């Protein structure tokens, strides 16, 4: 209750991105990166050197052996190079043989209480019943307490939105570029 820590940080510099934990550094603070827990830099910020938009941008979350907030927040910044300018004659890039090629086929993708997904260039939320808007991108209910509407992703929306209290409450925050 001191400047509001419920919510993820951002703080990108030229390529790098560091996202504050939405609570105190913990020496065991478990970190995850689309889904993925990382064992490797439990801080409080989340520093990302060379953050490719290609395969670094996605959801993220952190945890703690005492603080557990189901918590999500989709990062997407962009950093890379104008043009090119070194050198590089190892230019192979062999591609011919490809064991995926549907990010993963369909055999599934994500179904839990709150989810946003962006189709048509445009972008909703999705809880198990009424969505409760913490902040930022407050766009509008699509049907009734179901779905959100917030209108395109070029508008660089970002806030967050929790689900309803009833059988597991869970909350996601969005970030695009800054």
Same mark, same amino acid.
């Not at 504050?20 to 989340?46: A, F, I, R």
């Not at 890039?93 to 055999?107: E, F, H, I, V």
């Not at 445009?122 to 509407?149: F, H, M, R, Y």
């Given at each position: ?81 104008? !043009? %090119? #300018? +070194? $050198? =590089? ?5 062999? *591609? &011919?043989? !490809? %064991? #995926? +090629? $549907? =990010? ?5 993708? *994500? &179904? ?13 939320? &999705? ?52």
């Amino acid at each position: 209750d001191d400047a509001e820590n419920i919510e993820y940080k951002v703080s990108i510099s030229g390529t790098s991105v560091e996202l504050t934990c939405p609570l105190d550094s913990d020496e065991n603070l478990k970190w995850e990166k689309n889904g993925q827990e990382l064992p490797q830099k439990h801080d409080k910020h989340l520093v990302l050197q060379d953050f490719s938009e290609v395969e670094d941008s996605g959801y993220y979350v952190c945890y703690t052996p005492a603080s557990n907030k189901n918590t999500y927040l989709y990062l997407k910044a962009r950093v890379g190079s104008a !043009d %090119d #300018a +070194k $050198k =590089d004659a190892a230019k192979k890039d062999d *591609a &011919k043989k !490809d %064991d #995926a +090629k $549907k =990010d993963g086929s369909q055999t599934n993708k *994500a &179904k839990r209480a709150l989810e946003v997904l962006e189709a048509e260039d445009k972008v909703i939320l &999705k809880c198990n019943s009424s969505i409760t808007l913490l902040q930022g991108t407050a766009g509008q209910e699509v049907s009734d307490n179901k779905t959100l509407n917030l209108g395109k992703r070029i508008e660089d929306p970002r806030g967050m939105y929790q689900c309803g209290e009833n059988a597991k409450s869970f909350t996601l925050q969005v970030y695009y570029r800054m």
